[PDB]
């Protein structure tokens, strides 16, 4: 596998949402909008979901 073996939030290795763009691992409830189940399609972690790079 190519992402963390536990939720970056909990350090718990439950069902971890494999960020489609990066090796970040989270529980669907350790996100901003908690999910009742793993999303359909391209899911990105909070780290990847920032469109505006705050260079300043």
């Amino acid at each position: 596998d190519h992402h963390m073996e536990f939720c970056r939030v909990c350090k718990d290795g439950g069902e971890l949402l494999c960020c489609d763009t990066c090796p970040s691992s989270y529980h669907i409830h350790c996100l901003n909008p908690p999910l009742p189940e793993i999303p359909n399609g391209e899911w990105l972690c909070p780290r990847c979901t920032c469109p505006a790079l705050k260079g300043k």
Binding site: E5, L16, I38, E42
Partner: peptide, 11 residues
């Protein structure tokens, strides 16, 4: 969206 299941802190 993908998911892994490894070592969650149940034990």
């Amino acid at each position: 969206a993908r998911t892994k299941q490894t070592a969650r802190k149940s034990t």
